[PDB]
Tab-separated table of C-alpha atoms in Angstrom:
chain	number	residue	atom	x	y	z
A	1	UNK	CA	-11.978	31.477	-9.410
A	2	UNK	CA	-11.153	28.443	-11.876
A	3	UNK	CA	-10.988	24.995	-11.346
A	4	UNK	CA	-7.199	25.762	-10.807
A	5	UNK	CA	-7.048	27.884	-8.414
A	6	UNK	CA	-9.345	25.189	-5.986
A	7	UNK	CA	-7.006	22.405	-6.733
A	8	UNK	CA	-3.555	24.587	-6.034
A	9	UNK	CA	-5.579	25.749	-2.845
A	10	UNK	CA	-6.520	22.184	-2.364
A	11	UNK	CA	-3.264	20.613	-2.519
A	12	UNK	CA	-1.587	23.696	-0.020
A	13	UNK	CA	-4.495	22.603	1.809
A	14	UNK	CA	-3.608	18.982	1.965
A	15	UNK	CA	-0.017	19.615	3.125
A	16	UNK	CA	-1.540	21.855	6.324
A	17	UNK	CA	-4.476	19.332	7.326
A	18	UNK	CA	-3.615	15.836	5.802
A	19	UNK	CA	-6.145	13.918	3.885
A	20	UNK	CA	-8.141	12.997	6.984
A	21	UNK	CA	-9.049	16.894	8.073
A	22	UNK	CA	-9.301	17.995	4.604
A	23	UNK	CA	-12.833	18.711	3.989
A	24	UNK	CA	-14.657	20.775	1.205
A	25	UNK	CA	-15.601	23.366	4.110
A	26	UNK	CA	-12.058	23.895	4.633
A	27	UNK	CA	-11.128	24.286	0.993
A	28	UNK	CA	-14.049	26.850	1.249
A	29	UNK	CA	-12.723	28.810	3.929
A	30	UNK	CA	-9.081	28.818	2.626
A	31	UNK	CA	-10.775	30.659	-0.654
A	32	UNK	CA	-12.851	32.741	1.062
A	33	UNK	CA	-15.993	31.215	-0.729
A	34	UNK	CA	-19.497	30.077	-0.004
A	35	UNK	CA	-19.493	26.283	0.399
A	36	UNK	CA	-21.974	26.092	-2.928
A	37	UNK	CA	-19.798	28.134	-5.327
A	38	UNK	CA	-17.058	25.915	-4.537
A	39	UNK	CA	-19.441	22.622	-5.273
A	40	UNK	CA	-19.344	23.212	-8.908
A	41	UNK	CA	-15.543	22.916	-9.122
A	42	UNK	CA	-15.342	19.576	-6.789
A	43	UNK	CA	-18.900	17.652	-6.479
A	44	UNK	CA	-17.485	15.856	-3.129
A	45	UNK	CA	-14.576	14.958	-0.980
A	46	UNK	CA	-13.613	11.908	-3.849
A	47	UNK	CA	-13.974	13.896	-6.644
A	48	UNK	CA	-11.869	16.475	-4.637
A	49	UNK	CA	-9.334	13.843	-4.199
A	50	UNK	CA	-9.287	12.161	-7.433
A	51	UNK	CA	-8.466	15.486	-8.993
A	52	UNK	CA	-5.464	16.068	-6.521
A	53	UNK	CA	-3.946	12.919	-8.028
A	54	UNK	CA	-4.430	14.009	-11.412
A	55	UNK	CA	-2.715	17.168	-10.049
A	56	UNK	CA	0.074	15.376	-8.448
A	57	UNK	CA	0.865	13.230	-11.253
A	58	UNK	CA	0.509	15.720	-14.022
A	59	UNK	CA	3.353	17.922	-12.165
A	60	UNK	CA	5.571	15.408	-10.818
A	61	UNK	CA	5.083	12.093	-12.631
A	62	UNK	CA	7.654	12.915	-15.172
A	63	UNK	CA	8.483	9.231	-16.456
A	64	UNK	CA	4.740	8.842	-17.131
A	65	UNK	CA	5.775	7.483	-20.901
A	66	UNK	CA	8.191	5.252	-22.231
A	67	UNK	CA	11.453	7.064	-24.045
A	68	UNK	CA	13.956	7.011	-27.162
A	69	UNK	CA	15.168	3.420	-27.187
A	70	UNK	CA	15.615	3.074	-23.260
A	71	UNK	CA	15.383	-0.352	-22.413
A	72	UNK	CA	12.422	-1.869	-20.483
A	73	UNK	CA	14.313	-2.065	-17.919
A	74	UNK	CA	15.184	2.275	-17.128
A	75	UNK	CA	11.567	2.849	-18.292
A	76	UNK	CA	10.541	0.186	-15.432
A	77	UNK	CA	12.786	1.582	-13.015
A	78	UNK	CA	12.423	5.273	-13.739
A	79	UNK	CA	8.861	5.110	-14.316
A	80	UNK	CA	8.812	3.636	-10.323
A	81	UNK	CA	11.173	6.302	-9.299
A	82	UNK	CA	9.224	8.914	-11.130
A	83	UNK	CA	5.993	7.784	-9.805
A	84	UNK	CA	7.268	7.496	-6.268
A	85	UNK	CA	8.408	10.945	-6.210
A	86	UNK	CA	4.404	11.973	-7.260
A	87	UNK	CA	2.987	9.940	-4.096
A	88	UNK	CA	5.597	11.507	-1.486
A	89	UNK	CA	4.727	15.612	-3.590
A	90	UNK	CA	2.411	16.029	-0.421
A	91	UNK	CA	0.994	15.108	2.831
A	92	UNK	CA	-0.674	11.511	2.549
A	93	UNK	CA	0.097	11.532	-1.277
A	94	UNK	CA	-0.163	7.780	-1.513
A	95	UNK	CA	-3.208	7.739	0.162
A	96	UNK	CA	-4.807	10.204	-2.096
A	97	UNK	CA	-3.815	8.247	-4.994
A	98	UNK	CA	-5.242	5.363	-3.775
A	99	UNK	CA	-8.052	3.775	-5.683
A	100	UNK	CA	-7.882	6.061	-8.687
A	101	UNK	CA	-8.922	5.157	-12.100
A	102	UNK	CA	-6.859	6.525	-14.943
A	103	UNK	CA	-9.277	8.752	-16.833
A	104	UNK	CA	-8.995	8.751	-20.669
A	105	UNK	CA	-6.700	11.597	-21.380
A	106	UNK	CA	-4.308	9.053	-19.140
A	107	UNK	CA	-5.560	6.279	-21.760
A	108	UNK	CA	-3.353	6.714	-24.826
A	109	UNK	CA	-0.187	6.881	-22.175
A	110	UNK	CA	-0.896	3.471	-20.858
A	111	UNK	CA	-1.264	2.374	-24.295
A	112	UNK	CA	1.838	2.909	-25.197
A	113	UNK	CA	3.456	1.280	-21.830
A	114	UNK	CA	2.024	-1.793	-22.838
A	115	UNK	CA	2.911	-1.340	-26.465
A	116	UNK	CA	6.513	-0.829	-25.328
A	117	UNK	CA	7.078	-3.614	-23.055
A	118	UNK	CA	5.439	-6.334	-25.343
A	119	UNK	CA	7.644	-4.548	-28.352
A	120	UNK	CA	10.740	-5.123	-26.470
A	121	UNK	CA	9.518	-9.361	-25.517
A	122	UNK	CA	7.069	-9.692	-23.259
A	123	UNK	CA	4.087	-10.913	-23.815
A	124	UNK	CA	0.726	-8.619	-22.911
A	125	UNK	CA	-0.162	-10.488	-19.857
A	126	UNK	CA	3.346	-10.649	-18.384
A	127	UNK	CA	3.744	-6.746	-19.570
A	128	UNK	CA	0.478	-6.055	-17.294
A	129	UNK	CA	2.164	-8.651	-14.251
A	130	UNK	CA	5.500	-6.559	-14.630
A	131	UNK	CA	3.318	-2.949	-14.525
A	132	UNK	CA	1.080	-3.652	-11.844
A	133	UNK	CA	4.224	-5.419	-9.853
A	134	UNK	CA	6.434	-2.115	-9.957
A	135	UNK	CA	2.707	0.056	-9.291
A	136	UNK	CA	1.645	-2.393	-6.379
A	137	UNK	CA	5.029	-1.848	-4.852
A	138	UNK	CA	5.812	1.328	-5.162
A	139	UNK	CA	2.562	2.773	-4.050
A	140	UNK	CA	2.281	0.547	-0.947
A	141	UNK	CA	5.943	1.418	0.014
A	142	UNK	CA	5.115	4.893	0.239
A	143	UNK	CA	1.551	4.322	1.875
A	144	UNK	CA	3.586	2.703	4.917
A	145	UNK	CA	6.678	5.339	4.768
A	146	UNK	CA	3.384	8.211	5.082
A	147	UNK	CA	1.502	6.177	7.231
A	148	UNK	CA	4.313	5.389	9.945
A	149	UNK	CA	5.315	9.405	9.621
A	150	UNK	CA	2.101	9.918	11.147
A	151	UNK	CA	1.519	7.184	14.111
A	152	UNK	CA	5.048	8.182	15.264
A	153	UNK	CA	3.640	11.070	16.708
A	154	UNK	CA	0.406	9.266	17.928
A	155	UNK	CA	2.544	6.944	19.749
A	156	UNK	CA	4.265	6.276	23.007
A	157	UNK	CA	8.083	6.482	22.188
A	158	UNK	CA	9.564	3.381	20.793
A	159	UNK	CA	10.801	0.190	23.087
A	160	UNK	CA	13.909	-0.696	21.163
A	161	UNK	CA	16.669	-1.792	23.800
A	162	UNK	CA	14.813	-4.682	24.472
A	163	UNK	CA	14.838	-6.184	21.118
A	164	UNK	CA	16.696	-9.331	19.826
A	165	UNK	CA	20.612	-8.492	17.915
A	166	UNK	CA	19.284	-8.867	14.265
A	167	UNK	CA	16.024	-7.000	14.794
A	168	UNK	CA	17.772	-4.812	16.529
A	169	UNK	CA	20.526	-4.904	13.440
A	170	UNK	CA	18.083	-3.614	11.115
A	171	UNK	CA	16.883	-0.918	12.938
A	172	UNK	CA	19.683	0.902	13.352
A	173	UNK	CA	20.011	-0.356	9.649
A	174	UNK	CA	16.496	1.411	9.068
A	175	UNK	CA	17.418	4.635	11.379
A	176	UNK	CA	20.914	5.381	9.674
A	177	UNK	CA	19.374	4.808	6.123
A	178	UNK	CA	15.286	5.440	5.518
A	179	UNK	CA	13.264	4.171	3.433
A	180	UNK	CA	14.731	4.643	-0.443
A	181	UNK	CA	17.371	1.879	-0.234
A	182	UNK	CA	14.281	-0.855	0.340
A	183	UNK	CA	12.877	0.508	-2.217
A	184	UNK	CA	15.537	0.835	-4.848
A	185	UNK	CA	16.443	-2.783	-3.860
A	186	UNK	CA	12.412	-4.760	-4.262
A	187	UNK	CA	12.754	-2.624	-7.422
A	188	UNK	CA	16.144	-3.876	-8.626
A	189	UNK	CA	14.758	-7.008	-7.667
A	190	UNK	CA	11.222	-6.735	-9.944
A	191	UNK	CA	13.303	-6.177	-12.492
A	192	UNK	CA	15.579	-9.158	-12.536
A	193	UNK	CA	12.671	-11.646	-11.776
A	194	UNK	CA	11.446	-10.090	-15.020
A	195	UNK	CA	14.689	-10.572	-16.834
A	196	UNK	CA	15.351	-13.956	-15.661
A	197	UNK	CA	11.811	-14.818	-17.007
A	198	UNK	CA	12.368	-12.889	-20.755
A	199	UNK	CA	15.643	-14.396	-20.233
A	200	UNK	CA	14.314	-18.236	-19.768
A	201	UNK	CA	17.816	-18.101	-17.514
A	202	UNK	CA	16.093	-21.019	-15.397
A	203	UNK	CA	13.862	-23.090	-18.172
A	204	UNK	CA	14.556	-26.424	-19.343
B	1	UNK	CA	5.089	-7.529	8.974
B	2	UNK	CA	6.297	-4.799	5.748
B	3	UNK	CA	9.449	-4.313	7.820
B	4	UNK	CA	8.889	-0.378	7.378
B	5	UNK	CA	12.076	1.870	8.072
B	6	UNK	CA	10.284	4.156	10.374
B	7	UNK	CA	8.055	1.536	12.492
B	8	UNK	CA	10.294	2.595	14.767
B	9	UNK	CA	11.059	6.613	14.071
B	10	UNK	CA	10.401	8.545	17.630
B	11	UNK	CA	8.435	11.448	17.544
B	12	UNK	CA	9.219	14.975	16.189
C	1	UNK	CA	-6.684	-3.488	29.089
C	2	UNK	CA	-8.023	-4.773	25.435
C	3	UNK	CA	-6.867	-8.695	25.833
C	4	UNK	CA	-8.482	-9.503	28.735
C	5	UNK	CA	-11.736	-8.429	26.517
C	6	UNK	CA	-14.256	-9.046	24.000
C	7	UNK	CA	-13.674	-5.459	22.746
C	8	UNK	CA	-11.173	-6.330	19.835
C	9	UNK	CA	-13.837	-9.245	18.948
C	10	UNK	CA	-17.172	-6.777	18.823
C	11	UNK	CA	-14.868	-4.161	16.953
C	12	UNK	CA	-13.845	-6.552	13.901
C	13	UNK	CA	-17.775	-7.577	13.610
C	14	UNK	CA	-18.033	-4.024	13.377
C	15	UNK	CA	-15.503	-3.156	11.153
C	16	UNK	CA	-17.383	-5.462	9.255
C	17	UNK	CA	-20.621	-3.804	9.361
C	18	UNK	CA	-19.400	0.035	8.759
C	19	UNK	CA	-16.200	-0.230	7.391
C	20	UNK	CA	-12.488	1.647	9.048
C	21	UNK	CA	-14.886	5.240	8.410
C	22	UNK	CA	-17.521	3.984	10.689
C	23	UNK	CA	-15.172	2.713	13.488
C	24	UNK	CA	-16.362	5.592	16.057
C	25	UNK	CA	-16.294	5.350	19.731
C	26	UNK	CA	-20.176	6.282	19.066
C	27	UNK	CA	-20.955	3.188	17.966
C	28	UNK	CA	-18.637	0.778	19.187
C	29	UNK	CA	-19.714	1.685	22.583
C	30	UNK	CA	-23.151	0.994	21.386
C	31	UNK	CA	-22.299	-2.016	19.909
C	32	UNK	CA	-20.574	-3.446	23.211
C	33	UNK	CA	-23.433	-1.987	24.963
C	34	UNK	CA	-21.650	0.401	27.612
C	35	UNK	CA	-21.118	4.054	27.446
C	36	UNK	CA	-18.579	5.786	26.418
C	37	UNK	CA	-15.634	6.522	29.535
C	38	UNK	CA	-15.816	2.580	29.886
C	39	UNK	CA	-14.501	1.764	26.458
C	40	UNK	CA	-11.657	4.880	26.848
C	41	UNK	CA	-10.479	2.782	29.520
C	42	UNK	CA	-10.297	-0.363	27.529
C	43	UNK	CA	-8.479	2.349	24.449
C	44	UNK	CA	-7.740	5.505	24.826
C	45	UNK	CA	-7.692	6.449	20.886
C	46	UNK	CA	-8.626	4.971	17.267
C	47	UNK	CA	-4.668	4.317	16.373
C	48	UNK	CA	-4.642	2.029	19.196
C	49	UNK	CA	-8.086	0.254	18.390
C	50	UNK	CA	-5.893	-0.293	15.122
C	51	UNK	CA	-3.132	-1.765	15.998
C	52	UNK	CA	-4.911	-4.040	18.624
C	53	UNK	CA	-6.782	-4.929	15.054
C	54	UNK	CA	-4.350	-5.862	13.167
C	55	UNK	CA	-2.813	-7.797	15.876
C	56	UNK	CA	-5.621	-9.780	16.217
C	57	UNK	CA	-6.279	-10.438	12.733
C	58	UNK	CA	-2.732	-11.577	12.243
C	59	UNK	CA	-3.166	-13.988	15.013
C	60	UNK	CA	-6.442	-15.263	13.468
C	61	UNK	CA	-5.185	-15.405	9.749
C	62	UNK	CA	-1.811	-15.529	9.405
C	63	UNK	CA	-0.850	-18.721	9.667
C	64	UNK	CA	2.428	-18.828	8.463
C	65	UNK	CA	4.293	-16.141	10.209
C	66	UNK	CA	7.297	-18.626	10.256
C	67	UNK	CA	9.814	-20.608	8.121
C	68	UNK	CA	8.289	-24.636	8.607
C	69	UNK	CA	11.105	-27.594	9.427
C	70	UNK	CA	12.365	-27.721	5.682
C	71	UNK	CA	11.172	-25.146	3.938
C	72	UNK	CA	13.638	-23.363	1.428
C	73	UNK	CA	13.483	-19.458	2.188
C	74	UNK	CA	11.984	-19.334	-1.246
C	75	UNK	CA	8.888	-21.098	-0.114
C	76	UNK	CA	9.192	-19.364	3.414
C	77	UNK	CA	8.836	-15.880	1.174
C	78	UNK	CA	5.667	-16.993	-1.179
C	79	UNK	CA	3.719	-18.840	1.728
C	80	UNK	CA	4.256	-15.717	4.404
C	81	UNK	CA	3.298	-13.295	1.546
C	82	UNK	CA	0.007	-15.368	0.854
C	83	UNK	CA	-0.568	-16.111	4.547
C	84	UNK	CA	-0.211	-11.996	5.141
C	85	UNK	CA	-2.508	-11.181	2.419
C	86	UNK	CA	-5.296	-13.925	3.650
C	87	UNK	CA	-5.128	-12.116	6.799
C	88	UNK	CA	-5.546	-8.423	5.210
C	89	UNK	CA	-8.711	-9.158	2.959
C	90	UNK	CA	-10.359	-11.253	5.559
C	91	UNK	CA	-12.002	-7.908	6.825
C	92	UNK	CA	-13.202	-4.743	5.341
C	93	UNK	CA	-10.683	-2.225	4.907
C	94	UNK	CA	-8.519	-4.667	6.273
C	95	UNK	CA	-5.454	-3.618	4.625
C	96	UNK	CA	-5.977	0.059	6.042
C	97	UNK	CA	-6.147	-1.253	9.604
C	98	UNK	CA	-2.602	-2.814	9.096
C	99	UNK	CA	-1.407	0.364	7.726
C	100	UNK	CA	1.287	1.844	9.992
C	101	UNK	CA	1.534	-1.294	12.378
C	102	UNK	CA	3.834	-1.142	14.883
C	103	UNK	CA	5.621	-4.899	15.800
C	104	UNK	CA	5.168	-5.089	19.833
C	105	UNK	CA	7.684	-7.140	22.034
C	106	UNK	CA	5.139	-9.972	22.004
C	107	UNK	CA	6.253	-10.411	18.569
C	108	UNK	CA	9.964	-9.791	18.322
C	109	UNK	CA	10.948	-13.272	18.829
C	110	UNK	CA	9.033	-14.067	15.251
C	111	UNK	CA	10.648	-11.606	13.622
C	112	UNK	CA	14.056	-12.304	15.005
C	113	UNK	CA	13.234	-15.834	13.688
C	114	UNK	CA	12.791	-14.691	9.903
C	115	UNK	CA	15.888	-12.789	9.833
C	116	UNK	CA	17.632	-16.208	11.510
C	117	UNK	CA	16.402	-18.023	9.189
C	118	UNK	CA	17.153	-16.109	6.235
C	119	UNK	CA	21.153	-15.019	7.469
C	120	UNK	CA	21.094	-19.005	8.071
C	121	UNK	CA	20.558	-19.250	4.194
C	122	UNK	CA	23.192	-16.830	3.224
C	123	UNK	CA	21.469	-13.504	2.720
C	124	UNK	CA	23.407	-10.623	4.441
C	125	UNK	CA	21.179	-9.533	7.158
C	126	UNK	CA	20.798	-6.626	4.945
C	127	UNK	CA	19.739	-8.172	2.093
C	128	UNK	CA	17.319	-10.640	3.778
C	129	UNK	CA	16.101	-7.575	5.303
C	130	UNK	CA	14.927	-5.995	1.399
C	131	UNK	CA	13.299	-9.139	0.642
C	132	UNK	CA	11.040	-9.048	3.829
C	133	UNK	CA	10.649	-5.594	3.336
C	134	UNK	CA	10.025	-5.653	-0.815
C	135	UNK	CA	7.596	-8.837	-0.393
C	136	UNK	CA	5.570	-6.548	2.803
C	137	UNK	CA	4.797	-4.067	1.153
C	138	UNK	CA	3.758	-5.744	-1.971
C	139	UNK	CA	1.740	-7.490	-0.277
C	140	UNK	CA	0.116	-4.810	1.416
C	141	UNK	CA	0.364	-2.713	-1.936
C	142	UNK	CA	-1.969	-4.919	-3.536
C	143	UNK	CA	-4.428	-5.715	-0.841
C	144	UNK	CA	-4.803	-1.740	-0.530
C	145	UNK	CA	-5.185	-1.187	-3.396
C	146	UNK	CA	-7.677	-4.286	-4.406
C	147	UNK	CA	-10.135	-2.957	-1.502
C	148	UNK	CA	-10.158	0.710	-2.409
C	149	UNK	CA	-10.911	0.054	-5.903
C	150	UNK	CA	-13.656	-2.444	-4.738
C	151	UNK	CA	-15.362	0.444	-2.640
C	152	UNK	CA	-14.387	3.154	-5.003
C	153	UNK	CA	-15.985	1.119	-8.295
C	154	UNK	CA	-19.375	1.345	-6.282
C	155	UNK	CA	-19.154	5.492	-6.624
C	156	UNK	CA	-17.949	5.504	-10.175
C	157	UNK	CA	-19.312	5.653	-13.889
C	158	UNK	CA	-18.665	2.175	-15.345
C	159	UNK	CA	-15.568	2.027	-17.596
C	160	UNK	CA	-16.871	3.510	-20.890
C	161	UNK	CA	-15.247	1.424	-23.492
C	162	UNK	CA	-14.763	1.422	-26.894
C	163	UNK	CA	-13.081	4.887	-26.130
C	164	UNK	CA	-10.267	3.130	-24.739
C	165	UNK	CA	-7.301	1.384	-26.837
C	166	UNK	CA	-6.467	-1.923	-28.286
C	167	UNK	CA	-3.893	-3.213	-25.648
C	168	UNK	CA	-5.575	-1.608	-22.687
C	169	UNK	CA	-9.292	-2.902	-23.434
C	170	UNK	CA	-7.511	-6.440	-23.731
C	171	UNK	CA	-5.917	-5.860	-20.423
C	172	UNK	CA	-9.519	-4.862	-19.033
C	173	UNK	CA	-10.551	-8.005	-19.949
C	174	UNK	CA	-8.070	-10.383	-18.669
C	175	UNK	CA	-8.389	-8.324	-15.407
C	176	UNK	CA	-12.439	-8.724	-15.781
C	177	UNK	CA	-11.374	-12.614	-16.297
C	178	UNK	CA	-8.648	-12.804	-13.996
C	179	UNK	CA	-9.044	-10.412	-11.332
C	180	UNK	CA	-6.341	-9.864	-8.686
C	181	UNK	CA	-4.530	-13.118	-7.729
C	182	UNK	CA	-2.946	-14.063	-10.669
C	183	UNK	CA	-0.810	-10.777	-10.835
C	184	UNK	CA	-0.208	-11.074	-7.333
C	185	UNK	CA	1.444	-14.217	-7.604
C	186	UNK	CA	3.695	-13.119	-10.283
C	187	UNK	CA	4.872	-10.098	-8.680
C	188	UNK	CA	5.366	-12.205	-5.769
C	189	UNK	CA	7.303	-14.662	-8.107
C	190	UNK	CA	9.243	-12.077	-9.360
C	191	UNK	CA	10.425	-10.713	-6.141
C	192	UNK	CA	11.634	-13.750	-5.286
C	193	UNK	CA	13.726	-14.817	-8.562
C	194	UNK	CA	15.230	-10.986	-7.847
C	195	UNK	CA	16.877	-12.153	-4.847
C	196	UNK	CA	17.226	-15.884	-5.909
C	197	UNK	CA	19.724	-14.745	-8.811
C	198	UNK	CA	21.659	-11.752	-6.778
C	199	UNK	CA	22.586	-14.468	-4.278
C	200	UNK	CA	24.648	-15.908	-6.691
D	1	UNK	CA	-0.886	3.193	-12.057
D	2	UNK	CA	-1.315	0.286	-10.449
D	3	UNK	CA	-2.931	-1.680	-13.104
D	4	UNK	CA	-5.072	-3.163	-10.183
D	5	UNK	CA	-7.422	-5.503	-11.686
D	6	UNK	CA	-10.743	-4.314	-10.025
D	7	UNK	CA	-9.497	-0.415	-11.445
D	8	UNK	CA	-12.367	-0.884	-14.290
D	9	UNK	CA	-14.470	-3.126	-12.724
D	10	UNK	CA	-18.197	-2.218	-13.084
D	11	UNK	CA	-20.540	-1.840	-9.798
E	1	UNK	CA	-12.326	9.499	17.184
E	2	UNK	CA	-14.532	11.576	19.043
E	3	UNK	CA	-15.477	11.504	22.920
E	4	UNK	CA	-18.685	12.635	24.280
């Protein structure tokens, strides 16, 4: 009956009910515990879901740190991937993570991103740009990719012969392919803004 | 619009 | 039938007032002053209260949903992403209500426009299709995101400093100076010099 | 993260 | 949401 036990319960929890229907008196029932024992292990619903990001993170957020002499660009791009793969672990991953403050074990690792990036040329403020760029995009790609799992089912069935050719192109672009080639490709993309910037490609 | 890959996913 | 209504109107007032939580039939019913099997006939479930929404606030705050006579698709790109996120943060939780959105016929002829528009500039329809999509959710990325931190900060201890490192506590700072537009810009920037330089 | 701005903003 |  330790603080990990509630979170691995918590997180099997998550993928049954989804963020929404997750509740602490759920989490109690799943354990077989009064609703008070369990309070001293998660204070609230937040709390409950600020740890599952820690959770999710800690296990599958491998690329959390820079590495050897990879360039800036493989840590940017596998720290995106890496991070990616923590918000789709579960059920309404990205959601959870949403709105989360690092805490300071978390600190010293975010240090050292920084410390990386302006090592290898940038400058601190266009190191933070070029973090929160990759975050921003990765995290709101998944929160649609979850989001539109979901509605799907809460939705008549689509009206798609009916649309226009190159709408209609890109959804049976979409349908054959998902989501991870958009993603790869804004990423690619962050990445070469970046570089063309470093690179002062199109200065004067 | 995000253009999302599954806007248009059908159910199940 | 929602359009014919002030139902979408009272909800975003409301929406206002009790954030995406507080959006129950409960009280919008109250709000519009009718009971309850009146407004299921108006909407049958939340999801589609959503969607009318974000429909609506589109149509009330994004202003440029299209590329203008003369406008590079650079331009078309940074003033779309801009217009998009004026329309997300000018409710509460406004980015959550767009979450999920589902295009309806009414506006198929827009997007078939974009994608015109951007094939007519020489992107593969493809590739013009991972620029729409990589600026979207960006822009929706960051909106999220800026709201839930803004509610979230309300429930939360106050960064204790001094704990935290050189770099970082200077990047608090410029983010306390700062705050959200500048990066957004930038990223949006940097999108578009991606695909500016693949083209050729 | 993110590095959203508002992440250690202060109520 | 939740009818009555």
């Amino acid at each position: 009956l330790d603080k990990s036990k509630v979170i691995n319960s918590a997180l099997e929890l998550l993928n049954e009910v989804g963020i929404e229907g997750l509740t602490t008196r759920k989490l109690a029932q799943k354990l077989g515990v009064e609703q008070p024992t369990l309070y001293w292990h998660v204070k609230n619903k937040r709390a409950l879901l600020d740890a599952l990001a820690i959770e999710m993170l800690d296990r599958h957020h491998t690329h959390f740190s820079p590495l050897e002499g990879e360039s800036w660009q493989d840590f940017l791009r596998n720290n995106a991937k890496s991070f990616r793969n923590a918000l789709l672990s579960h059920r309404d991953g990205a959601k959870v993570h949403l709105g989360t403050r690092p805490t300071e074990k978390q600190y010293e690792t975010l240090e050292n991103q920084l410390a990386f990036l302006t090592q290898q040329g940038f400058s601190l403020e266009n190191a933070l740009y070029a973090l929160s760029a990759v975050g921003h995009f990765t995290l709101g790609s998944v929160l649609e990719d979850q989001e539109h799992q979901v509605a799907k089912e809460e939705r008549e069935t689509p009206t798609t012969d009916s649309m226009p050719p190159l709408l209609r192109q890109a959804i049976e672009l979409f349908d054959h392919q998902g989501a991870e080639p958009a993603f790869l490709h804004g990423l690619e993309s962050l990445i070469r803004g970046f570089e063309v910037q470093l690179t002062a490609l199109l200065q004067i | 619009w995000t253009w999302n890959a599954y806007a248009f996913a059908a159910p199940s």
